[PDB]
Amino acid sequence: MRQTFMANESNIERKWYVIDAEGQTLGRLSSEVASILRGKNKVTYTPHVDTGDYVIVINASKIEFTGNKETDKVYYRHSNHPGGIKSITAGELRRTNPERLIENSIKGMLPSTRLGEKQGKKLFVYGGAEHPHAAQQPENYELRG
């Protein structure tokens, strides 16, 4: 228990990025955003403290699936009432509410602790090429590869 830096509040500096989902694959974009979102690209990554940045997934209406996942790839839920499953296909949740589609994909790639879901609240997804956060000075981030 010697010299090892540990970041904390009053030591953290969070930023804002814009990211375009125009031409990207759904789950291959979702996984770089979850690493930006969780503070694992910064040298001062501390596990018990919220590092990480804010991300604005700008477009979100042009995200792409591959194969037959437009009519395959059904999403299920239960109302907690008897016989209460409900389902929607991946291509229909893009024609209807294409922001919930990207929000639920990235959130399944974060932990389910109190900190893990304080971090998915730094996620803002928009269908269409405009965001209302122009006052936060968002930069631009490119997906590797």
Partner 1 sequence: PRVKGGTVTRARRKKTIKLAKGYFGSKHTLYKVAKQQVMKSGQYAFRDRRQRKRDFRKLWITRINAAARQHEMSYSRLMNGLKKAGIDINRKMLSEIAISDEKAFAQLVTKAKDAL
Cα distance between residue 26 and residue 66, in whole Å: 9
Chosen from RNA, partner 1, none, partner binding at 116 (C-beta under 5 to 8 Å by type): RNA
Given RNA, partner 1, none, residue 43, with its beta carbon under 5 to 8 Å by kind, binds partner 1
List of E strands, 1-145? 16-19, 54-57, 74-78, 85-89, 123-125, 139-140
The 91-110 site mask, x for binding RNA (CB under 7 A), equals: ------------------xx
Beta bridge partners of 140: 18
Q: Which is nearer to RNA, 6 or 129 (CB)?
A: 6
In the range 49-68, which residues lie near RNA by CB under 7 A?
A: 49
- Tell the smallest beta-carbon distance from residue 142 to RNA (Å): 13
Q: Which stretch binds RNA (CB under 7 A): 2-10, 55-63, 67-75, 91-99?
A: 2-10
In the 8-state DSSP scheme, what is residue 64?
B
Q: Which of residues 126-145 bind RNA (CB under 7 A)?
A: 144-145
CA distances from 39 to 26, 35, 97, 107 (A): 21, 7, 28, 15
